[PDB]
């Protein structure tokens, strides 16, 4: 448990806690929503396509999304409300997922240059919804569905 984050389980997982060691790969679906009346969806892995797949970089120093994932069991579906303090990073993080969904490598030099240039010129991440999210810091809910943990 971390401050500013409420976990709710909507479908209980199966089995013992996955082995969430350094280098293991987590396959999951997720949906991100505002906390407005409509619960406006910001991103939805199922809608766009295939599930996300991340590698735990270091079990001893977890990324924020790893803090979420490593609390989960296979097949679990949980909703995590995260206060404004945890979510200011989400728009750039979504930016980068969205470009990888496309054919673009956000780490390639021409892509990253264009991003910084448009961001300085136009104060934009390339996406109206993420821009409005960054201009208005606020809570988000992430619903995550954990599908599979693979050993390294």
Chain residues in the site for ligand GER (CB under 6 A): 30, 52, 54, 64-65, 68, 82, 86-87, 89-90, 93, 97, 142, 144
Torsion angle of the four alpha carbons 112, 113, 115, 121, in this order, in degrees rounded to the nearest 10: 170
- Comparing CB distances to ligand GER, the nearer of 52 and 74 is 52
Shortest separation between residue 22's beta carbon and ligand GER, angstroms: 16
Query: Least distance in Å: CB of 67 to ligand GER?
Result: 8
Task: Compute the least distance from the CB of residue 19 to ligand GER, in Å.
Answer: 19
Q: Nearest 10 degrees: CA dihedral of 6, 30, 135, 96?
A: 130
d(CA 28, CA 45): 9
Q: CA 128, CA 130: separation in Å to the nearest integer?
A: 6
* Residue among 77 and 90 whose Cβ is closer to ligand GER: 90
Nearer to ligand GER, 68 or 77 (CB): 68
Q: Helices (DSSP H) in 4-149: which residue ranges?
A: 45-48, 64-69, 84-87, 90-101, 109-122, 128-135
Q: Between 144 and 149, whose beta carbon lies closer to ligand GER?
A: 144
CB 2 within 8 A of CB 81: no
CB of 132 to ligand GER, least distance (A): 17
């Amino acid at each position: 448990n971390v401050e500013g984050v409420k976990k709710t389980i909507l479908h209980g997982g199966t089995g013992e806690l996955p082995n969430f060691i350094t280098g293991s790969r987590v396959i999951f679906h997720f949906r991100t929503m505002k906390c407005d009346e409509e619960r406006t969806v910001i991103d939805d892995s199922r809608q766009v396509g295939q599930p996300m797949h991340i590698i735990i970089g270091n079990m001893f120093k977890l990324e924020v999304w790893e803090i979420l994932l490593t609390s989960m069991r296979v097949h679990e579906v949980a909703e995590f409300w995260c206060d404004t303090i945890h979510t200011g990073v989400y728009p750039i993080l979504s930016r980068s997922l969205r470009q990888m969904a496309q054919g673009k490598d956000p780490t390639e030099w021409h892509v990253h240059t264009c991003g910084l240039a448009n961001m300085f010129a136009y104060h934009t991440l390339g996406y109206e919804d993420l821009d409005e999210l960054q201009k208005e810091p606020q809570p988000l809910v992430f619903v995550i569905e954990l599908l599979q943990v693979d050993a390294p």
